[PDB]
């Protein structure tokens, strides 16, 4: 493995890493605000902070498995105060696009430095993290579609409910 | 409903499961290339992943109970290390220091009268005590084994056989 | 043996539980039949929690009778009938709850004074069963409140409720 | 709709129902503790104590169903003192013909009244009723037959005990 | 790692189960040969004292697996001569009731000294010894309601022979 | 009938195998504890042994209770719970069996001079395995004198023994 | 093949368990006929009866196998007048103990004279008859605990039915 394709793996596990914990804090919003419990939305985010670690974890499988030694950085808190769940699903949306490009950017240093054994390792998380993004601008869009007048809240979450249900069956 | 101060105590353990997962990583990478020492590797990183798993565990009882959690900047762990008894030997007396914590919550949810809080935790405190447990064996084993001739290579068998064993 | 302290208090228990089963029940009837809209999913569900809390009852009997202990069983109070809404019987039926799970709490204290160990060992499925109710009814409270009254709030609230009683049982 | 005469009279039968119930717990008890145990006894009361809630539980589903307000009053202090086995099957056995002819009481209004949905329904009713009835009888019944001289008790408690056991 | 207190009370507790398998067989050879035999109560407190030394190795296992030093002590001669069926009984349950207590007091010790991985473990044996008292009381019971008059002594040694039967 | 002296032999025999049992409780205990490293090979091995010599004592009870004959159990002295390595205390079990197939050819000697063929029929399935515990008792010891304690062999040893235990079960 | 001395203590013992089978027929009327009918013990001795004759056929079988004339005597006619049961079980035991015995002879014998083969034949006779003893022993001791006062007979009668019964 090159220099730079090892700085950005482990750059990477980081990124996942404190993914997770944002998640995790998004959650805890869901159920209990910035100090209604959306249980449909924090069940949802609880379950991506996990997939999260299980991609930190499928990374430093591969260092380990490259004999590359893995660097873990602090980690910083994660926001905890959000005002309001489209705010929250737009925070995650971006995000994600964040990750996604990150991604990207290891993908390209692979093909420049042709590092195609780790081209190829990567295709499995270029795939999910693409499916994820997805995922998130689809919900983002249906809470826009919902709106908030009356029950619009407790639609919206019954909505994530299912999709948390339905990607665990 | 929970106390001002059980709330606390389970948000400090949180961080404390999560920071216990990124040094058991740590470790785990000091295995595989800090000689390989793959049966090690494997069971520190298994049991990173099952300290992580701890703390979701407690992340849902908290949002079940809707007390907010509050994770916390953590420092970077440990990376270096002088072999493979003294890695052994900091991760056992850091699941002792775990053991303890747990302890404190327990007997402040006794104090406290917070019996569904004490109920909750028992699969805590016993699985806690499973590892603490496991950790001395292997330390132990390790120092039986001895480290002249191939020593290292039997004890690494010897740990890849109990990672083995654990998932299956 | 049991204690005399421990004695009375789960005599008292055995009687609290007959009581919260009637309450239960009378708090079903309101949503069937209430000064007005027949609530039907919050009926069954309140029916089934009433004969549940009268579970709890008859394996406390059992205890005792196994025991050798006497039962003194008091008058049952006849409940309270008339509610404001549904919000405020399911605000009730929380309170309700929280008293039982410090009543239940205070037994286990005394268990721990008294070295009852023993007592202590039986009690453990009935803190963590209460604890569970507790958090139910605590649930279905924050539901009502996310969805509201306005429109057909309270047929969303009562399917929702309704949805709940079904898969628990 | 129902009747407001038998509305009135469901009602109060499920308030009989109920205080029925806790009779049977307090003779269960002074089987157990009123030394020595009579369990069969003890089991047998308990367990009929149980049917009687289910009872009271199924006559407030109609109710519900008829969209009918179910009134619960206060249940009495059950008496908790008695002189003896075959006491105790004696007062249990006239409770029992009481909740018989208060069923009748109701059955007979209902014809009166031409309500045959309610009439139809309550015939799962009469008949367990008159089923329970007749247990009691024998059973005060055997009771008698055995005596208690010698190890008389013991066999009337073995007996019941029996009972109890082939009708769960 | 345990601490010293409860690692003696541990130890005392494997020894006390010890001693109670050994009078157990005492009392059950009493039960055969104390003419005629009471095999239904011989077999019933064999098969007791076979239980009670599974509790035993249950607590040595606990102990090793902990890395902490079983001592056993000398298991003073039981006694071997009783006075009947019912003062046989009342021994034992007697005896039952001080193992009882002698399990609290481990229990309550840790909790006060927080070693709450031994508490947890102990739940099995706080729970299996009070089915075990409860057990002892209700046939001492039996005896007594049964009597000793005519064949009493037969029917009490078939009663106990049915519970042994029962619980294999 | 049994005869006095019988009787007495057979005695002696339930309470040779409970003091046998204890010893080997004890030996199991110094194989995971004693003064330094753990065996839990051997340890989980003696265990097993001292439960199985428990059994056998439970047996000749059974066999006593059935043939109506007092059983007489005496103090059972505590064990010895200091030894010198893994050599030492598999020789010292090993001579500790050799005793036991002695006294209980010697009850099987007995048994044919007064004429009881029922206990001589009795005693066969203790003959065997006796003699079964006996031989391997021998064979771990000789195993452990050729592997010997140079390096890693203790290790070699008790993973030996720990095979052993676990195949008999 | 087998000594002269051997050959003639196993043809005593063939007629020996004719002798047998033919008394506990006898007993079996007694019990059935000898007003009142012991059926329980009627069916258990006349089943016993029939598994004397199977040790007859047994050790035959072994004599014409190992080429040796069988030499059937006559067989005296049996006790037909009792006292009472206890009496009747009593002469039983007494047998039993007298088979048992000329079993060990047989067996000794074997020894002193190197019959090894015909040693290790009998190892299942000296078995069973060992459990037939004690069998008659429990029964007859049995007896002796329920007594005959009351219904004493009848129950004593329900017991050794029930073992018949069971070993069947
Ligand atoms: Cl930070
Ligand atoms: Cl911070
Ligand atoms: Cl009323
Ligand atoms: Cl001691
Ligand atoms: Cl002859
Ligand atoms: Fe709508
Ligand atoms: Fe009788
Ligand atoms: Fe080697
Ligand atoms: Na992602
Ligand atoms: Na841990
Ligand atoms: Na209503
Ligand atoms: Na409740
Ligand atoms: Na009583
Ligand atoms: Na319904
Ligand atoms: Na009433
Ligand atoms: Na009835
Ligand atoms: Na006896
Ligand atoms: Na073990
Ligand atoms: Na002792
Ligand atoms: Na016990
Ligand atoms: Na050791
Ligand atoms: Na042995
Ligand atoms: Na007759
Ligand atoms: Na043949
Ligand atoms: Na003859
Ligand atoms: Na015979």
Same mark, same amino acid.
């Given at each position: 493995?090159?220099?730079?394709?090892?700085?950005?793996?482990?750059?990477?596990?980081?990124?996942?890493?404190?993914?997770?914990?944002?998640?995790?804090?998004?959650?805890?919003?869901?159920?209990?605000?910035?100090?209604?419990?959306?249980?449909?939305?924090? &069940?949802?985010? %609880?379950?991506? !902070?996990? /997939?999260?670690?299980? *991609?930190?974890?499928?990374? @430093?499988?591969?260092?380990?498995?490259?004999?590359?030694?893995?660097?873990?950085?602090?980690?910083?808190?994660?926001?905890?105060?959000?005002?309001?769940? &489209?705010?929250? %699903?737009?925070? !995650?949306? /971006?995000?994600?696009? *964040?990750?996604?490009?990150? @991604?990207?950017?290891?993908?390209?240093?692979?093909?420049?430095?042709?590092?195609?054994?780790?081209?190829?390792?990567?295709?499995?998380?270029?795939?999910?993290?693409?499916?994820?993004?997805?995922?998130?601008?689809?919900?983002?869009?249906?809470?826009?579609? @919902?709106?908030?007048?009356?029950?619009?809240?407790?639609?919206?979450?019954?909505?994530?409910?299912?999709?948390?249900?339905?990607?665990?069956?």
């Amino acid at each position: 493995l090159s220099k730079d394709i090892i700085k950005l793996l482990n750059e990477q596990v980081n990124k996942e890493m404190n993914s997770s914990n944002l998640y995790m804090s998004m959650s805890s919003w869901c159920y209990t605000g910035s100090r209604y419990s959306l249980d449909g939305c924090g &069940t949802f985010l %609880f379950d991506h !902070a996990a /997939e999260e670690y299980e *991609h930190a974890k499928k990374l @430093i499988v591969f260092l380990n498995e490259n004999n590359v030694p893995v660097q873990l950085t602090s980690i910083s808190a994660p926001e905890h105060k959000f005002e309001g769940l &489209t705010q929250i %699903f737009q925070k !995650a949306y /971006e995000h994600e696009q *964040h990750i996604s490009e990150s @991604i990207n950017n290891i993908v390209d240093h692979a093909i420049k430095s042709k590092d195609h054994a780790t081209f190829n390792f990567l295709q499995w998380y270029v795939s999910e993290q693409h499916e994820e993004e997805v995922l998130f601008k689809d919900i983002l869009d249906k809470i826009e579609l @919902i709106g908030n007048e009356n029950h619009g809240l407790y639609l919206a979450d019954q909505y994530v409910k299912g999709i948390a249900k339905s990607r665990k069956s």
